[PDB]
Amino acid sequence: RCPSVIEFGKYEIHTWYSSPYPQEYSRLPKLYLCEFCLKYMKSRTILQQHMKKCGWFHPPANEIYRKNNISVFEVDGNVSTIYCQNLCLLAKLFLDHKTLYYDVEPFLFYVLTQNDVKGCHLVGYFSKEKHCQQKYNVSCIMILPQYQRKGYGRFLIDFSYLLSKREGQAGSPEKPLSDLGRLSYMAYWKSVILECLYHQNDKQISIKKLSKLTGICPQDITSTLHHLRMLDFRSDQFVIIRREKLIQDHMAKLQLNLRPVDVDPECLRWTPVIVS
């Protein structure tokens, strides 16, 4: 509703929700955003003038991940504060339940970009609390509309699990999950569990073992196994019943429909480690 449209790089995009841009820009219907620094401006002329002075061609942070034309930048809210507050204002136009936009200092923002000769273009991001008592491995996650349904959301979800698993603790997305989040996370969990069971043939695996190998918390694995119809209960606790054709057919579909956008652990420049 307010603003209703934004210009961002080579696209004009309809907003889904209101975001609290400053009073002067609040009642403005269309905002012009710089695609590199995320500064909000009132007109195309002001944007064109800004683009001549703007020195950034990628987010103001170091590249934690790079493979082919894809990068992830680890942006610290306590360091690139203005950029992160501008990113939060941008994300609120597409996340109805994101409430944090100003106190960004306790958060990290993993900004995903698709790169070409004009720079590192922002595709989306996920934020995470540096220290979360609930072990939420993602606070908010958003892929811009023109980049949705291309495997970027799965990439970022998988990246979030790579970090929380390398730091030895299972995590889960912060709730509530949007409708798209519910579909996306379940598809991720299902694909991960199925590919994990395929590679662990010689092991009567358990929810606990699946949780350690994947970083997915036990309750989310339990829900996923319930969705896959691989749970049974006789007496004390759930037993996993493998549905072999479900496992074997998923792996066959994966071998023909490759995952072109896929997190390669060897392409992280720095990875978490539990300190001695």
Binding site: H97, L100, E129, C132, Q134, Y136, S139, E174, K175
Partner: peptide, 8 residues
């Protein structure tokens, strides 16, 4: 502390 979807 409180996250980005923390009810306000």
């Amino acid at each position: 502390s409180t996250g980005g979807k923390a009810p306000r």
